[PDB]
Ligand SMILES: O=C(O)CCCC[C@@H]1SC[C@@H]2NC(=O)N[C@@H]21
Ligand SMILES: O=C(O)CCCC[C@@H]1SC[C@@H]2NC(=O)N[C@@H]21
């Protein structure tokens with residue numbers, strides 16, 4: 246259920262393939278941020294999630310460099326997939342920019358996002 | 364550089380190879396939590412960091428499933444490499460557990476960790 | 482705007498008073514977690530907000546001790562009030578438990594919540 | 600135990616009084632950030648902690664407005680006090696700026712800070 250195209254409320258587009266092994270592979274297109282076009286993403290997910298009614302833990306990273314720009318920054322999303330008619334991926338993310346040590350205290354933004362199929 | 368074997372204050376072991384395309388690949392061994400032995404990790408880093416003195420942004424993900432057990436959870440570390448005194452990776456992390464919907468509100472732990480090579 | 486009774490998605494109840502000097506006071510009632518009935522809260526808000534459509538920064542804290550039980554934990558919410566149309570308060574929160582040193586790595590939960598008066 | 604002057608690595612200084620009922624009151628002096636002079640802080644702490652060696656949960660807020668300036672932003676620190684020979688306050692913090700709706704995605708910084716009785 247994770248492989249495919251997912252959207253967040255901010256207008257970004259996450260295209261993923263979930264390998265049989267636990268790999269997450271794909272591209273991210275950010276609607277906001279110092280970004281343009283697609284960026285490589287790589288991640289991991291629980292390929293044998295709980296057999297009750299729990300989501301599927303996952304995580305992925307995008308470093309914000311591609312052929313057109315480099316934002317000298319990296320976002321990790323940590324969350325879980327919840328399947329069904331309104332499948333979704335509920336995440337929290339951390340966006341760290343490379344900084345001088347004097348500015349390291351403000352290197353990291355924190356946010357959250359729910360991704361959907363529509 | 365970032366390729367190498369790194370350790371945090373807890374004694375976990377992070378073994379990573381940074382590839383030229385921006386890929387991070389390796390294994391992670393947790394000194395605490397619902398884990399044993401090594402776990403696959405994958406992530407991304409800025410392959411062309413600023414020369415201005417800033418760190419190098421990166422992130423990586425561990426899904427806490429391997430051959431011996433499955434914690435149904437995933438941690439992402441978001442941070443920057445500092446090829447500084449000791450070189451170090453300063454991170455913040457998010458550990459998300461697959462939960463039921465009623466428990467999603469407590470799905471995610473947050474913490475921070477500095478890794479060094481000794 | 483801020484002064485009022487607010488609810489989050491979890492159905493918890495946030496009853497707050499904004500004093501004219503930047504003080505937030507009131508009670509919090511959690512619908513989930515190791516809590517029951519009302520808990521004291523206190524916090525601070527920007528009493529002279531930007532007047533450029535920006536939100537009103539604020540935060541508040543609940544220590545989860547009251548006459549009925551004590552969870553030995555405390556949550557802080559950090560967010561901004563957005564007035565107008567449908568007023569809401571958008572937050573991120575940090576729930577820290579008193580733990581031993583060895584368990585401090587898992588002492589803190591993070592989440593997010595939007596409060597509305599509906 | 601918590602009452603007194605506390606220092607972090609950034610050079611900021613936090614003065615706090617822990618009330619018997621659980622209130623935290625005082626001022627925070629930041630040494631980095633869009634900040635000058637002292638700022639009011641208020642918060643709460645577990646005033647009947649575990650005696651088992653476990654830390655004392657607590658949190659506080661600073662709205663970064665005082666008589667000298669206004670950063671239109673607020674920080675909350677969430678953490679636990681650990682007493683002893685080497686007392687400290689182990690925290691994580693969220694600093695939220697007021698922002699337009701379209702900028703909300705980047706409204707909040709996250710960080711961590713250990714406070715000590717000695718600089
Ligand atoms: O601005 C940068 O440093 C690079 C672009 C970051 C875009 C962020 S990642 C979190 C949020 N969700 C998105 O889809 N875009 C932003
Ligand atoms: O869900 C679990 O218990 C497995 C998580 C593994 C341990 C966590 S990840 C963050 C922190 N750093 C470590 O080295 N271990 C813990």
Ligand SMILES: O=C(O)CCCC[C@@H]1SC[C@@H]2NC(=O)N[C@@H]21
Pocket residue numbers: 468489491493510511512513514515516545552553554555556574576578592594
């Ligand atoms: O369980 C505890 O340690 C004390 C109660 C904490 C409840 C949390 S605070 C964040 C979230 N929002 C709520 O309304 N309840 C939970």
Ligand SMILES: O=C(O)CCCC[C@@H]1SC[C@@H]2NC(=O)N[C@@H]21
Pocket residue numbers: 350607609611628629630631632633634663670671672673674692694696710712
């Ligand atoms: O810049 C602002 O928006 C107001 C001041 C922010 C200062 C931050 S709060 C977290 C960290 N700890 C400090 O002592 N200063 C910074």
